[PDB]
Amino acid sequence: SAYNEWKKALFKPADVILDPKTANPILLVSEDQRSVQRAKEPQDLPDNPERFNWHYCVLGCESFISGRHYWEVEVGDRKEWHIGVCSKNVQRKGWVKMTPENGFWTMGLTDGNKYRTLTEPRTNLKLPKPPKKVGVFLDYETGDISFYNAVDGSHIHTFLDVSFSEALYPVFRILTLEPTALTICPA
């Protein structure tokens, strides 16, 4: 596919590994640091400043301050998940809504079949086919964050022309307790 042939020509493949120091205590990061699951109850962890203590999210280890980058995430048959990027300086303690205004550029799935962007207000997406693998693409210079179905190259959503100033981290959120994890594809 053109998607597969060209993605590495235009975007640097990011090798994203999850940062356990950032993960909400109810999340489990796999040994290989590519996958995240939820626990039934929060685990006993320090409340170090880097850790999300309310939002059920986790960041990649590395942030971006320039250039074009991409990574792919196997969402599989999960009924709930949200992914994208956030600013380094987002509020990690307590709650502010995950929205672009609050430094989050994310989309995902809720309730099995409701795809949406995490905007204010949330906006529904109409997807021809349910994606199993999602490519997340960042062009720092153009301010574009795009999401594609990684299997067939179809477009899912683009946040256009954002005026980035802060470093951007891959972010991942899961709320539900389900058999399938959320898993980053290695570069």
From Swiss-Prot:
Residues in the Cytoplasmic compartment per record: 1-187
Subcellular location: Cell membrane
Reported modifications of this chain: N-glycosylated.
Domain of life, source organism: Eukaryota
Span of domain B30.2/SPRY: 1-187
Expression tissues: Detected on T-cells, natural killer cells, dendritic cells and macrophages (at protein level). Ubiquitous. Highly expressed in heart, pancreas and lung, Moderately expressed in placenta, liver and muscle.
Subunit structure: Homodimer.
Cited function: Plays a role in T-cell activation and in the adaptive immune response. Regulates the proliferation of activated T-cells. Regulates the release of cytokines and IFNG by activated T-cells. Mediates the response of T-cells toward infected and transformed cells that are characterized by high levels of phosphorylated metabolites, such as isopentenyl pyrophosphate.
Family: Belongs to the immunoglobulin superfamily. BTN/MOG family.
Protein name: Butyrophilin subfamily 3 member A1
